[PDB]
Design a protein around this nucleic acid. Structure first.
Length: 19
RNA sequence: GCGCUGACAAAGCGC
């Protein structure tokens, strides 16, 4: 199951929204 | 395993 593969790219953006 | 929601979760739900 693709948890980490999706997460990696989504994470960068998710963080950068809050930032 | 790859998406897709979610906490950048776990879990779910497609392919």
């Amino acid at each position: 199951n693709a948890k980490t593969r999706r997460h990696e790219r989504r994470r960068k953006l998710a963080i950068e929204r809050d930032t």
